[PDB]
mmCIF file of C-alpha atoms (C1' of nucleotides) and ligand atoms in Angstrom:
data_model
loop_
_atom_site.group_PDB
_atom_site.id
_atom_site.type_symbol
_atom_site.label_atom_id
_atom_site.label_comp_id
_atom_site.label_asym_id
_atom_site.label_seq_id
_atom_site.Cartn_x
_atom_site.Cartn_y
_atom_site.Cartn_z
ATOM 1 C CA UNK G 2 0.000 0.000 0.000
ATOM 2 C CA UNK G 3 3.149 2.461 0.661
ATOM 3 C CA UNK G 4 2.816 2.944 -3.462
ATOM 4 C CA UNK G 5 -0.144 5.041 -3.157
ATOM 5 C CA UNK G 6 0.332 7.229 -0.479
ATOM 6 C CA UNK G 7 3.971 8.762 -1.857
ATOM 7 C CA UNK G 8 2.689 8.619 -5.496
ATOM 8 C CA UNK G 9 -0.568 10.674 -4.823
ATOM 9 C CA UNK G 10 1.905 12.908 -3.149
ATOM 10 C CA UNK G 11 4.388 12.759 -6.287
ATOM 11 C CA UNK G 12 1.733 15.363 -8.254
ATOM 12 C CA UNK G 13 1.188 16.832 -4.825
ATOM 13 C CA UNK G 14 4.766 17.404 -5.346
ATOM 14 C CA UNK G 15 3.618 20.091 -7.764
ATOM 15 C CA UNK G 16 4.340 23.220 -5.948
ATOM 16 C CA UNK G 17 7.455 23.196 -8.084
ATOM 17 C CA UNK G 18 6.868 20.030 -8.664
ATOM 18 C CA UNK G 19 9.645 18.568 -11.407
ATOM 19 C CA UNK G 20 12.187 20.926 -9.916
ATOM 20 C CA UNK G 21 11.025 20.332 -6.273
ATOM 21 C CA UNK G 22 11.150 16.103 -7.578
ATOM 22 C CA UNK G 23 14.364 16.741 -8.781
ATOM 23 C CA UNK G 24 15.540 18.225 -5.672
ATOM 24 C CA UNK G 25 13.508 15.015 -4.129
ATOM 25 C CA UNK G 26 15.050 12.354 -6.276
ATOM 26 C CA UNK G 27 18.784 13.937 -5.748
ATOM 27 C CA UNK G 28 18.060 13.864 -1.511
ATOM 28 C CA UNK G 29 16.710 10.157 -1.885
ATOM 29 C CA UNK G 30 20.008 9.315 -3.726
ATOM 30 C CA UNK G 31 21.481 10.439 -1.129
ATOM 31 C CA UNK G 32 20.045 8.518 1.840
ATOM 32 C CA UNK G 33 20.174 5.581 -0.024
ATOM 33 C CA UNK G 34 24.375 5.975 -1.050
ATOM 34 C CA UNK G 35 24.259 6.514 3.167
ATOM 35 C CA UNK G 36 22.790 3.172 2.864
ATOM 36 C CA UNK G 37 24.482 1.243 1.267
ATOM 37 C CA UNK G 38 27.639 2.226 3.033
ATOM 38 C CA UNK G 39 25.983 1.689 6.053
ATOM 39 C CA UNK G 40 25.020 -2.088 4.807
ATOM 40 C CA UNK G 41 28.389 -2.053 3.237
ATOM 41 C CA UNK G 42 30.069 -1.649 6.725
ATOM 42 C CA UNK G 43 28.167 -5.072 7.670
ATOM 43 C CA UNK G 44 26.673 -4.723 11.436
ATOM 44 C CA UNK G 45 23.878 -2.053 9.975
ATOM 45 C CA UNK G 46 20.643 -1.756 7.843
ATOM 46 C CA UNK G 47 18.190 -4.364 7.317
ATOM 47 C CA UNK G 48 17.794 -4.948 3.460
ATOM 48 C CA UNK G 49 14.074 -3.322 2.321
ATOM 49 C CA UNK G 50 15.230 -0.147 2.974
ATOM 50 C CA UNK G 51 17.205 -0.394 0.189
ATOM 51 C CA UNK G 52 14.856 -1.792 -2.154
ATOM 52 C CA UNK G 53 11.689 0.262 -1.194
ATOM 53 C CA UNK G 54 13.893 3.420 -1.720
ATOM 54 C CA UNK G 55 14.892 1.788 -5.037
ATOM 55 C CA UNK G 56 11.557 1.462 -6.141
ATOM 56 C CA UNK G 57 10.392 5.180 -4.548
ATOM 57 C CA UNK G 58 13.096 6.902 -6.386
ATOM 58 C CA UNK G 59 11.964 4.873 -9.683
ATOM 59 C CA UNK G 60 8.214 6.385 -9.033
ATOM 60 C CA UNK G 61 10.214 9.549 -8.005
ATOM 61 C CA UNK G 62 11.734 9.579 -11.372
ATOM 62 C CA UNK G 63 8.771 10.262 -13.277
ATOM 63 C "C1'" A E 21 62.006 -110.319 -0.074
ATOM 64 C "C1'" G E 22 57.283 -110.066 -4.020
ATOM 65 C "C1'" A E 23 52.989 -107.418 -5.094
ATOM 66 C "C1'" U E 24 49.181 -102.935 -4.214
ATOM 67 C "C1'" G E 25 47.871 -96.731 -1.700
ATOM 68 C "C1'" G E 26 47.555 -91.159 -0.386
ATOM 69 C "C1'" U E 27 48.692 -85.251 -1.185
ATOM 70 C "C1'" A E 28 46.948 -79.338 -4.513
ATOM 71 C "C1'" A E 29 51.689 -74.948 -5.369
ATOM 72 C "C1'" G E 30 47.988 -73.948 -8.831
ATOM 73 C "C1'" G E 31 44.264 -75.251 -12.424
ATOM 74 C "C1'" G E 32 39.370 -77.029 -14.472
ATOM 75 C "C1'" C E 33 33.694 -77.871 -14.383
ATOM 76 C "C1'" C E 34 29.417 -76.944 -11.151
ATOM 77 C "C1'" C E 35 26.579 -74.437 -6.981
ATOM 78 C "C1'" A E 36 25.654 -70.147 -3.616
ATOM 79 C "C1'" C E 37 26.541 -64.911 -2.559
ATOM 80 C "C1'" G E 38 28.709 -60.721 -4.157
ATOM 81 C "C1'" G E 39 31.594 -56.651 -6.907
ATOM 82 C "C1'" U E 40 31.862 -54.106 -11.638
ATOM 83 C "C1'" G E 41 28.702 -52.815 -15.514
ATOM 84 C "C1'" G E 42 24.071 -50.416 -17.292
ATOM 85 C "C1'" A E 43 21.305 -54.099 -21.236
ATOM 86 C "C1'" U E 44 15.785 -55.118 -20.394
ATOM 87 C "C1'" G E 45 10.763 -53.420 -18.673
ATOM 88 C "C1'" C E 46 8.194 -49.545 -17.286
ATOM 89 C "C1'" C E 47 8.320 -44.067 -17.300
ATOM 90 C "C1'" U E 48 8.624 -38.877 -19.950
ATOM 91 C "C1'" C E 49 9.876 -31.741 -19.335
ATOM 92 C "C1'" G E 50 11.257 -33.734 -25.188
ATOM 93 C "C1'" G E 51 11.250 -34.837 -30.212
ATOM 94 C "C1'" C E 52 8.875 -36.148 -35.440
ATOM 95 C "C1'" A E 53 4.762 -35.903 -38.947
ATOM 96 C "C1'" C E 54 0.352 -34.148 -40.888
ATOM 97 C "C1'" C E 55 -3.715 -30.583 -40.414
ATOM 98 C "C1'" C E 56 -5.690 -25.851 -38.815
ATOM 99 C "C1'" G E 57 -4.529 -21.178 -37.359
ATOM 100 C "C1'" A E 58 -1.317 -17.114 -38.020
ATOM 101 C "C1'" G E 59 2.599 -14.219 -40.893
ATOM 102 C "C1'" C E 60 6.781 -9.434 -41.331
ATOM 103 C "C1'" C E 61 10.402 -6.653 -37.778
ATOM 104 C "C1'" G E 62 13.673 -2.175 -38.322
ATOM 105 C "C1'" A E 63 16.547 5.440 -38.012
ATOM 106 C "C1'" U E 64 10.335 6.075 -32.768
ATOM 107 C "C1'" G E 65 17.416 2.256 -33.838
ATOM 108 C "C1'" A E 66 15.465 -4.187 -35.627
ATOM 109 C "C1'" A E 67 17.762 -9.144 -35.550
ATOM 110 C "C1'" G E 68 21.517 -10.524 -32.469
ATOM 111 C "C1'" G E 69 24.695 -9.107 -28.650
ATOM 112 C "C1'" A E 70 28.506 -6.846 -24.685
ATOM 113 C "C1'" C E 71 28.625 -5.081 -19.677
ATOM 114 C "C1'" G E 72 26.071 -4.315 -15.910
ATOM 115 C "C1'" U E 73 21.299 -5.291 -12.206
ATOM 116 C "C1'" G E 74 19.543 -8.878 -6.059
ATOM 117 C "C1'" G E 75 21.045 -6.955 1.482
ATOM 118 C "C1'" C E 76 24.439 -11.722 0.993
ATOM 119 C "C1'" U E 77 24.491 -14.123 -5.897
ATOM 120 C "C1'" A E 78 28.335 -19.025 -9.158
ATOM 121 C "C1'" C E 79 25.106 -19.936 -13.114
ATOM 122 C "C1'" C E 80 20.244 -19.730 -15.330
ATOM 123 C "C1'" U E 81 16.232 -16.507 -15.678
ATOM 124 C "C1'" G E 82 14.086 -11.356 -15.812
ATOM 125 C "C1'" C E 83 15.431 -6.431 -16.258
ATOM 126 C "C1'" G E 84 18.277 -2.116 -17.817
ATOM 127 C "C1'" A E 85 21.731 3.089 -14.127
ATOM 128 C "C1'" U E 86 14.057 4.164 -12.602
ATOM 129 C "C1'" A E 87 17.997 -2.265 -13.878
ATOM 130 C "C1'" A E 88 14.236 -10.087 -10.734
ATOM 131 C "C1'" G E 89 11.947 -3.749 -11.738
ATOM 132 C "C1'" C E 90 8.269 2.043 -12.683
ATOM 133 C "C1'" C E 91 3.101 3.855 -13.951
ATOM 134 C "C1'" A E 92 -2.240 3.200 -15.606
ATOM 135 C "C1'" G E 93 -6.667 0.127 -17.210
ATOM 136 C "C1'" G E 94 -8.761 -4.926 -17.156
ATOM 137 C "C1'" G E 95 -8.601 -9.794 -15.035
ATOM 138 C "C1'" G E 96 -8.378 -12.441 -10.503
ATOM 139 C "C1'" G E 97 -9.397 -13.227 -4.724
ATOM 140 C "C1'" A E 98 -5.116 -15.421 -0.775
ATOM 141 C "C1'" G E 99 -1.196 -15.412 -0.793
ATOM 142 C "C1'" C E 100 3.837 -13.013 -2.118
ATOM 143 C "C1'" C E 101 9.523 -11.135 -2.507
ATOM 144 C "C1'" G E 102 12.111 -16.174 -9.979
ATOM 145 C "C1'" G E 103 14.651 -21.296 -10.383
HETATM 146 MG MG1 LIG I 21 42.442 -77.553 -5.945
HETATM 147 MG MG1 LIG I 22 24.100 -73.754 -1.947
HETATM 148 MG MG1 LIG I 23 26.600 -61.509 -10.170
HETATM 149 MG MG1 LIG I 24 27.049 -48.969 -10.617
HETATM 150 MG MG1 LIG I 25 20.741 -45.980 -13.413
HETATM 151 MG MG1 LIG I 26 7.839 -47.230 -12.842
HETATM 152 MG MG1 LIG I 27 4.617 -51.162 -23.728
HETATM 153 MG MG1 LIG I 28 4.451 -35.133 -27.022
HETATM 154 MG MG1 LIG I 29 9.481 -28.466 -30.597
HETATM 155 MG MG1 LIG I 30 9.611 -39.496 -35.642
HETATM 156 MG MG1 LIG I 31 -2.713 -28.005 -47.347
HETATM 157 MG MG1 LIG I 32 -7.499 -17.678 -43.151
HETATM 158 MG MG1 LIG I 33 -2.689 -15.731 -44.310
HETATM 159 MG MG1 LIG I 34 -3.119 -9.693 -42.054
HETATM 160 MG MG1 LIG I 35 11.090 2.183 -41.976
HETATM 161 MG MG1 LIG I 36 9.755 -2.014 -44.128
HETATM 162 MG MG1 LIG I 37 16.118 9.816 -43.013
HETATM 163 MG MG1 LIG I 38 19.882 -10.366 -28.490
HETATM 164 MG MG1 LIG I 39 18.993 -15.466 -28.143
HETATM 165 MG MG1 LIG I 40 20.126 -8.859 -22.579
HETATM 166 MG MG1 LIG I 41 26.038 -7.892 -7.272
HETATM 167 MG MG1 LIG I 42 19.687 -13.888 -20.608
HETATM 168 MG MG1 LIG I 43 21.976 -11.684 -16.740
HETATM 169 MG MG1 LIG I 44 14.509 -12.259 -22.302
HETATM 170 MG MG1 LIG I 45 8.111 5.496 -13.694
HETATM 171 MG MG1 LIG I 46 2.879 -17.412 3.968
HETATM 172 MG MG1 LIG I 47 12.464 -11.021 -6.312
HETATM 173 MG MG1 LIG I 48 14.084 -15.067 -0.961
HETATM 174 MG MG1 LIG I 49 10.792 -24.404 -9.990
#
RNA sequence: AGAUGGUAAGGGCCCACGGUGGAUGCCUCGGCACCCGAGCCGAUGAAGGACGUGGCUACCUGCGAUAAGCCAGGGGGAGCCGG
């Protein structure tokens, strides 16, 4: 169910929207680099994270 | 004095039980033939590929830096994150 909450936001997202996404997109990038460094490091993260931000920044990117 | 017997280092035939081997029977995701259907794809970059893609991934598979996936409509009604 997470899809439709965040992509109902997405157009929400249209204050600015596809320069406020990109600025979106870019910070999501971000947290997810932190992630995999931090399940690169071993001890840390707990896979799905990874994946579901995957996928978000894939609905992101439109 | 005269006259007559027994042993198996190993071998041979047979019997019993094995080892090796994968014939035979049964089986079948596959294959063959005919018939019916259907019949073009590409610069809006095909056919076919290379390298990449999974939290951990050797290969296969799927996919393409949005990477075993993204969105929307329809189906479907308890399971699901491929092998
Ligand atoms: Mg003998
Ligand atoms: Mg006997
Ligand atoms: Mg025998
Ligand atoms: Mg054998
Ligand atoms: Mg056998
Ligand atoms: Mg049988
Ligand atoms: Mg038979
Ligand atoms: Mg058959
Ligand atoms: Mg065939
Ligand atoms: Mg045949
Ligand atoms: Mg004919
Ligand atoms: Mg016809
Ligand atoms: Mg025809
Ligand atoms: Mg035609
Ligand atoms: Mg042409
Ligand atoms: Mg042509
Ligand atoms: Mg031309
Ligand atoms: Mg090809
Ligand atoms: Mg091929
Ligand atoms: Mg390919
Ligand atoms: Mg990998
Ligand atoms: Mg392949
Ligand atoms: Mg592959
Ligand atoms: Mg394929
Ligand atoms: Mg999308
Ligand atoms: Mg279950
Ligand atoms: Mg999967
Ligand atoms: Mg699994
Ligand atoms: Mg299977």
């Amino acid at each position: 169910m997470k899809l439709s909450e965040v992509r109902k936001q997405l157009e929400e997202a249209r204050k600015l929207s596809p320069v406020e996404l990109e600025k979106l997109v870019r910070e999501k990038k971000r947290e997810l680099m932190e992630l995999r460094f931090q399940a690169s490091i071993g001890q840390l993260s707990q896979n799905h994270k990874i994946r579901d931000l995957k996928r978000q920044i894939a609905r992101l990117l439109t």
